[PDB]
Amino acid sequence: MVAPLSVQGNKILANGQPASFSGMSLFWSNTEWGGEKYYNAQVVSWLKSDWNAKLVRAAMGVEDEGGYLTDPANKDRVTQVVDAAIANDMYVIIDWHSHNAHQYQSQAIAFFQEMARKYGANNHVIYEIYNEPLQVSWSNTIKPYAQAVIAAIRAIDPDNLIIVGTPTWSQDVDVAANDPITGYQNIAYTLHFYAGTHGQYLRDKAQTALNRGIALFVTEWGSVNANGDGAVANSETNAWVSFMKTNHISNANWALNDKVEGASALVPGASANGGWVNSQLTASGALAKSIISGWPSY
């Protein structure tokens, strides 16, 4: 058992105090996308014991090739991680990893209903219903999808956090803050930043959203470019880390994966079952492990 998370204004609370949790996003769960081998109990317990992670995100592909809509095996991999997180007293994000979730609303509702029924009683579970909306209306496209999916979760699970994607690849948290979801408790809003691409401009939008009284949750962030490749931006990453520690913002680094790209935490061939020596981390993985392991415990 872990502390139940709630939202009060711009804070996520645990044990009656602002609290924040640091860990890794798994890569896309999709069949033959390469991330899938890391969807297992051994990776989850290694992240806890070696990285001191208190958070793992299962990034379940939806309408993209080899995703949940065409290969239900995606959900078996989510189940493995969620079960493992619960066994290790770690928070787990169930991420509907779509850029167009509002086009697959019925499928989203059915999936979150199933996840709520199975896992709703565990305080570990965090629902993320819409990874990264594109350049679409908050009020007219995202919010009504959010309302429909939240209603369905909340009929089954009245408490557990629901994180809602925001416009422009989950950047426009200031926009969401101007028309928040008020109808349901324990709703927080997605912020995504890639330190090779995003600095103070996006932090200012985040500050505006916090000032307007909504809670943020960085379910995905990178130390490299927005496209998941490029050099590690150490200085900008540290600026984001200070911002997130100051505002008690939970964070999952993209990505626990071995693909040849800057965002991968692991060198190609890093064991599917964990145990990685530090020399089998990339610059991004070494920076992500230093951030997660150093995260305030509260």
> Given 36, 63, 65, 132, which residue is catalytic?
132
**Rounded CA gap, 167 and 152, in Å?**
22
- Amino acid type, 245: K
- 242 belongs to a structural domain: yes
Q: Please, what is the Cα angle at 192 between 68 and 75, to 5 degrees?
A: 15
Q: What are phi and psi of 109, to 5 degrees?
A: -65, -45
Q: What's the burial of 296, exposed, middle or buried (CB within 10 Å: 0-12/13-18/19+)?
A: exposed
Rounded distance between C-alpha atoms, residue 8 and residue 62, angstroms: 31
Note the resolution in Å, 1 decimal. 1.7
Residue 298 lies in a domain: no
Judge contact between 102 and 145, C-beta under 8 A.
Answer: yes
Whether residue 162 lies inside any domain: the answer is: yes
- Number of domains the chain is built from: 1
Domain containing residue 72: 6-293
Q: CA 88 to CA 292: how far, in whole Å?
A: 16
Whether 28 is covered by a domain: the verdict is yes
Tokens coding 1? 């058992």
Catalytic residue among 36, 65, 128, 220: 220
Is residue 106 assigned to a domain? yes
Side chain identity, residue 132: E
38 backbone dihedrals φ, ψ, rounded to 5°? -90, 0
Give 165's contacts (C-beta < 8 A, 6+ positions apart): 101, 128, 129, 130, 131, 132, 133, 142, 190
Our answer to whether residue 220 is catalytic in this structure is yes
- To the query of whether residue 236 is one of the catalytic residues in this protein, the response is no
CATH number at residue 159: 3.20.20.80
Note whether residue 87 is domain-resident.
yes
Burial (CB < 10 A; 0-12, 13-18, 19+), residue 134, is exposed
How far is residue 160's CA from residue 266's CA, in Å, rounded to a whole number?
31
- What is the rounded radius of gyration, in angstroms, for the C-alpha atoms of the chain? 17
In a domain, 129, yes or no: yes
Q: Is the dihedral of CA 46, 50, 55, 59 positive or negative?
A: negative
**Residue 1 located in a structural domain:** no
Distance CA 165, CA 265 (A): 24
Q: Which DSSP string corresponds to 120-183?
A: TT-TTEEEE--S---S--IIIIIHHHHHHHHHHHHTT-SSS-EEE--HHHHT-HHHHHTS---S
